[PDB]
Nucleic acid binder design. Sequence first.
DNA 1: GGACTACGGG
DNA 2: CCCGTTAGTCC
Length: 205
Amino acid sequence: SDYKRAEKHLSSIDNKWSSLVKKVGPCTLTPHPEHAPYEGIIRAITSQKLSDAATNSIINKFCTQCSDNDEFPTPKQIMETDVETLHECGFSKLKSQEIHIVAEAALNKQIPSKSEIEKMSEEELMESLSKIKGVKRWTIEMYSIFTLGRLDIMPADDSTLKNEAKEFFGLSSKPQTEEVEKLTKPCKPYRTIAAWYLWQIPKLH
DNA sequence: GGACTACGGG
DNA sequence: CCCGTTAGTCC
């Protein structure tokens, strides 16, 4: 598998990478490529500046409030929900508005199809999805990693990743995005897995 | 009880 | 890199 290859590739870089992979164990990153783009994008938007626990509670309230079935709400279902009802699920007002925008775009077929997104390079995904209000570099990276299942995404702009890179690379302060990109270059073409390993560091304590 | 913990807005 | 937001956890 690519995970097995990624684990061996990372371990091959140097002793610290080898040790990190051994401490954390096999990669268990589980993306959900079965999700429609509007769903993956809404999930990523919700996660901005929020813990996974908070994001989870919000999406769960969202499903119960807007779905006929407690499944992920459809674009039509989202459109039929007023902003304040969305807001009481725990989205910020601004995210609530952006989620309506995503739904309307999906409903109007203004989002690229799932089929075309699955053919796009990271660069094309960035160009295509960043037009959506509330969706910029980080959100697209998270969509690419946790929905699409892309293997070579380095979300070097992610604050948590920078903090773990600080620890792993033995830095005395928080690295800039561009510094993280340089430091993780040898991890190509499995930078998503590299990022996942760094992200597991707090669980080692 | 809290401190603070990507993105658009003004 | 002016300013404020959503929630839950664990400092």
